[PDB]
Design a protein around this nucleic acid. Structure first.
Ligand SMILES: [Mg+2]
Ligand SMILES: [Mg+2]
Ligand SMILES: [Mg+2]
Ligand SMILES: [Mg+2]
Ligand SMILES: [Mg+2]
Ligand SMILES: [Mg+2]
Ligand SMILES: [Mg+2]
Ligand SMILES: [Mg+2]
Ligand SMILES: [Mg+2]
Ligand SMILES: [Mg+2]
Ligand SMILES: [Mg+2]
Ligand SMILES: [Mg+2]
Ligand SMILES: [Mg+2]
Ligand SMILES: [Mg+2]
Ligand SMILES: [Mg+2]
Ligand SMILES: [Mg+2]
Ligand SMILES: [Mg+2]
Ligand SMILES: [Mg+2]
Ligand SMILES: [Mg+2]
Ligand SMILES: [Mg+2]
Ligand SMILES: [Mg+2]
Ligand SMILES: [Mg+2]
Ligand SMILES: [Mg+2]
Ligand SMILES: [Mg+2]
Ligand SMILES: [Mg+2]
Ligand SMILES: [Mg+2]
Ligand SMILES: [Mg+2]
Ligand SMILES: [Mg+2]
Ligand SMILES: [Mg+2]
Ligand SMILES: [Mg+2]
Ligand SMILES: [Mg+2]
Ligand SMILES: [Mg+2]
Ligand SMILES: [Mg+2]
Ligand SMILES: [Mg+2]
Ligand SMILES: [Mg+2]
Ligand SMILES: [Mg+2]
Ligand SMILES: [Mg+2]
Ligand SMILES: [Mg+2]
Ligand SMILES: [Mg+2]
Ligand SMILES: [Mg+2]
Ligand SMILES: [Mg+2]
Ligand SMILES: [Mg+2]
Ligand SMILES: [Mg+2]
Ligand SMILES: [Mg+2]
Ligand SMILES: [Mg+2]
Ligand SMILES: [Mg+2]
Ligand SMILES: [Mg+2]
Ligand SMILES: [Mg+2]
Ligand SMILES: [Mg+2]
Lengths: 123, 129
RNA sequence: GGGAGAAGGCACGCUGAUAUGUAGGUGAGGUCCCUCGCGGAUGGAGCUGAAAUCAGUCGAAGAUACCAGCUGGCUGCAACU
RNA sequence: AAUACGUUCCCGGGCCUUGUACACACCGCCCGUCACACCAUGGGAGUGGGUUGCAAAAGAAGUAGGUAGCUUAACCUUCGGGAGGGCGCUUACCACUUUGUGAUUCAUGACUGGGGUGAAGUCGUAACAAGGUAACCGUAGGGGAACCUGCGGUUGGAUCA
RNA sequence: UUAGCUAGUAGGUGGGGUAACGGCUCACCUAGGCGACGAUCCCUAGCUGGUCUGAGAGGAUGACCAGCCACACUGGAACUGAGACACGGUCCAGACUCCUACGGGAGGCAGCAGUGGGGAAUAUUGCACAAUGGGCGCAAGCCUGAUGCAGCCAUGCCGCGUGUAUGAAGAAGGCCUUCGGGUUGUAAAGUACUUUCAGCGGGGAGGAAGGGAGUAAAGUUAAUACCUUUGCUCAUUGACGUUACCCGCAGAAGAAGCACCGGCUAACUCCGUGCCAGCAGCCGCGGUAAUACGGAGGGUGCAAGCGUUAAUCGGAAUUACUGGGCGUAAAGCGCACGCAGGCGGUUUGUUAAGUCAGAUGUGAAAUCCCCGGGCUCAACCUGGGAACUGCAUCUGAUACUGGCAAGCUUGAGUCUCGUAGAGGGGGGUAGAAUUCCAGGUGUAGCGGUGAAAUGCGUAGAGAUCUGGAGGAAUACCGGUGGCGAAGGCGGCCCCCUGGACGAAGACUGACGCUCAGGUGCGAAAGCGUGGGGAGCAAACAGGAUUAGAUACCCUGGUAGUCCACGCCGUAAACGAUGUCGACUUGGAGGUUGUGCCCUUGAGGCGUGGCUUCCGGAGCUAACGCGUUAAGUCGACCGCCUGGGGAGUACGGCCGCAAGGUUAAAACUCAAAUGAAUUGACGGGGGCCCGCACAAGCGGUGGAGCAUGUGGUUUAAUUCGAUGCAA
């Protein structure tokens, strides 16, 4: 409180701790698929959510979501990951970029295609 | 201990005023007497006197209007723990000029208005509205 | 308290200078006092004498021979002599 | 027909009041061990790198100092040589490097500790009501677990008839 | 979670040295120099103009442009030179690569292109010296990956287009629909009409100043030569370039996608799915009507982009200087003393550092902002201004702060006499009780619990009376009583000793307040040595309870609880409220001084210290606090910055140990928390009702049979009703 006190010990803003450290302030990172599996989510939800463990080009190894309905990914699949947690999946803090590198687009999508790596259908 | 007698002066005013007191009295000092002068001249108190020679007691006659205290706020600005000085072109004004700031200059204690008009800066002793 | 001489490093002979022998040790003549002696003070002669620094110098080698610890890390057992 | 003084006691309920960590509201909430999966982290005989202190060892090139040997167009010469220079040698500084022993930091390590997170599992029921032994704090001992027990302290304890 | 650092070290003399001052260097001499105003050590980093953000103060940042510095494969070195310890120089050493006929050589893209590698990701091995500028040259000119330009990429900013107008029962198709119709939608088709841009032809500024031949005049000079300057004419110099721009031709012709529509948030319906598949910035969607998933129709928002991710600031008053907090929400150190430090009552004089005023210089340009100018507009370019809120020098002002000198007495102390007190330390001593020992009387139980049993008693308990030993604690007094900084302190007496308060006046003269670091104190438990040991009682044993019962209850009982001397340093160490000072209405009490009044009553009127309960304004989220503040102010300190992780780990200091102290991060969640409200609930309470109990009379539970259910059986024993309420 005292002026004297601040003069001895200045106000010191807290440094923000990141939510996607594996990215190291990069917009995406590349990595190899270590395990490709499903996992169940947290109260109150229930499903078999597709996730993968991925060793990134910078050594970090993280779990990443594989959004969309259907995917053709396996071990040694080279994928691109981006920031973005999965809320009912604790530990999951990244998303896989559908339709980049070895990851295919979602099949048969018509709405929100660009978020699922899907070309515009000839029509 | 009693390390700021001006805050003490401000406060004795503020509290007796809040307590609808007719007058307040405090150990005197030239600097208090110089401030009391400005208050009176700007119509925030009726009048004042100092009594005694060896242990001078200063007395301020407070002022009321609509069964209200003329002095709405009275606050210490510069203080022993943090002296505040301003330049002529930096002189604050209280309530957009409706109130006053008491300023201490090379030419004695006067209002922000006075010091402004006389090309001076000084230590900002208090605000009054 | 130890562990510890842990480990590891440097110096090391000879000659000269400082000082023809130094710091120190010892101490005579002389002078003076004295409760006079196997005495005290003063005095410093002679004798003896390590060590250091500087400079120089010989050899492959200066603790030159005899003499004279090898050192360190983990672990069982018994405290210890 | 009998019997009711009466409302202390059982059961259901009404009003006032109080405590609550309950609100799908006590068929409530909630605690720890244990089992399984995942995450990060500490310890760990060690393993591998970075940087660094101290003690020494080392001494390329260069520059400067010294200079007997060798060598030299310009200047001096009494024509023999001089002065001066170069080379070589030598000394000082110092890079690489070497040795010994410490310090520090990063990564990693059989295994091990506790921690966090999970729809549901096993054991009990520790706290919340006076939670059925009031709770909690410090401490100490004990016990599958929540905990129990002793000592002192606090009220952030219900009821006081 | 670095406190000490330093031998050329700090200074002096003299010689040497540099372009020059200088421990720059050397000798000698002195023993200094730096450091809590942060040295040393460790981590990180080029600095600035400015950039982004913010109303501002700030926060974040240092591409592109410009200024300074540093580097040129790594480490070291000097040579040449006005300048270098040299970006395409030299030498040595290292790492590495290339050539070789094997003996020996050569090189350094962090210049411009380009390559490999790394990466989510960043371009062509282009044209020209025409322009500006640099090197050389008298010049002509030569060189210039500076520069001017061109290529590539939606990377961004700005501009424009992808047509304009007309077009209705408003078609077909799609979608919704209660089958009436609504919608897509003037949208489309049709009808005229325009032609930017792209395409194709035609024409054509400016960036060009110079330089070259001649000529003429001046200055030169012996000269009309030459030289140089300035006019004149002639012929010339553009990489960009198919330039900008202008005209013509053809036809709407070649030019629309992306995200979103549950709330925050502009935009709703159907079908599919069914806690799946899936969505998800936050809340939260998904088990049969899902505007939240996925498709569709419709709609909203953007538009050559649109979304997602990353990233800074904002909102965030969420590090609070401007601009916050610590009773119960995160936060007062357990308490005190106190160095450094911060702050400091009142008067005079002095000073003029802080502060204030003015003047002068400087604060590069660009950027930002204002008014103009130029490209068709805009981006962009540009003139002038204002601004750079800053620094420095000089000259003044003297109220406030600081220095200096003298003071002053109210703050603070000292003195005198008294008062109250479980304040501390030591030594004595007392009566009650328990247990034990020894006896008298007495005889079959005592003890314990909810009930018991273990236990104790005919070796005579328990009960009673008597005598004695020992330890521990001090009933009544006793009380929102008292004392102490806190912890805490209680029988009585003495001794040693600290503090508080009152009365009166004298003395000192601001000697004061606060306090990081430091030091001391600090309940209980615990630790070490030796004593002590009645009662109590962790551990432990036995008896019970219980489904279990490592408990609660009982019978025993060790450490411990007690003493001395050491250690530990923690508690809900609490008023969960730091210390000091000043100020602000009241009522009732408790306690303890003291002045006055026929003391004429156990009183009457004042005046201090402490304290309890209410309560006023004000404060507060509320609860509550309320002259003992949580009100109004000031001085200084400590501490907080979402929950868990954690008062944990690592490091340091401390401890015999147990452990204490200082004190992180990863990870994880969207909560955790405070006060108060309405319910419900309680093995909480009060008051009150009902054949609820109590008072009565008769039953059911036994028997045989009727009947319903369960179960069992069966091919089937049909389905339902299941605590009171089957
Ligand atoms: Mg020698
Ligand atoms: Mg063995
Ligand atoms: Mg032995
Ligand atoms: Mg009842
Ligand atoms: Mg580890
Ligand atoms: Mg319970
Ligand atoms: Mg209980
Ligand atoms: Mg207890
Ligand atoms: Mg000199
Ligand atoms: Mg760097
Ligand atoms: Mg550049
Ligand atoms: Mg560039
Ligand atoms: Mg620059
Ligand atoms: Mg170099
Ligand atoms: Mg030179
Ligand atoms: Mg340079
Ligand atoms: Mg190069
Ligand atoms: Mg690559
Ligand atoms: Mg239709
Ligand atoms: Mg065209
Ligand atoms: Mg031209
Ligand atoms: Mg809406
Ligand atoms: Mg969506
Ligand atoms: Mg549906
Ligand atoms: Mg962001
Ligand atoms: Mg802020
Ligand atoms: Mg706050
Ligand atoms: Mg309270
Ligand atoms: Mg708290
Ligand atoms: Mg306290
Ligand atoms: Mg004067
Ligand atoms: Mg214009
Ligand atoms: Mg401009
Ligand atoms: Mg200008
Ligand atoms: Mg400028
Ligand atoms: Mg003064
Ligand atoms: Mg007795
Ligand atoms: Mg006096
Ligand atoms: Mg003991
Ligand atoms: Mg017991
Ligand atoms: Mg013991
Ligand atoms: Mg504590
Ligand atoms: Mg009150
Ligand atoms: Mg009130
Ligand atoms: Mg946290
Ligand atoms: Mg700890
Ligand atoms: Mg409460
Ligand atoms: Mg009955
Ligand atoms: Mg029957």
């Amino acid at each position: 409180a005292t002026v004297n006190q601040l003069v001895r010990k200045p106000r010191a803003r807290k440094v923000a701790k990141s939510n996607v450290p594996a990215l190291e302030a990069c917009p995406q990172k590349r990595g190899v698929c270590t395990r490709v599996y499903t996992t169940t989510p947290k109260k109150p939800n229930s499903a078999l959510r597709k996730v993968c463990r991925v060793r990134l080009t910078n050594g970090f190894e993280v779990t990443s979501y594989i959004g969309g309905e259907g995917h053709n990914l396996q071990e040694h699949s080279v994928i691109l990951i981006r920031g973005g947690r999965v809320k009912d999946l604790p530990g999951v803090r990244y998303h896989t970029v559908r339709g980049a590198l070895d990851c295919s687009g979602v099949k048969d999508r018509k709405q929100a295609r660009s978020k699922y790596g899907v070309k515009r259908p000839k029509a | 201990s009693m390390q700021d007698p001006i805050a003490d002066m401000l406060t004795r005013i503020r509290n007796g005023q809040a307590a609808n007191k007719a007058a307040v009295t405090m150990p005197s000092s030239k600097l208090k007497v110089a401030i009391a002068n400005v208050l009176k001249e700007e119509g925030f108190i009726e009048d004042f006197k100092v009594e005694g020679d060896t242990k001078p007691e200063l007395e301020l006659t407070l002022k009321y209007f609509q069964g209200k205290a003329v002095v709405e706020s009275i606050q210490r600005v510069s203080r022993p723990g943090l002296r505040i000085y301003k330049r002529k072109d930096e002189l604050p004004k209280v309530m957009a000029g409706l109130g006053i700031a008491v300023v201490s200059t090379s030419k004695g204690v006067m209002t922000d208005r006075a010091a402004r008009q006389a090309g001076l800066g000084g230590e900002i002793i208090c605000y009054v509205a």
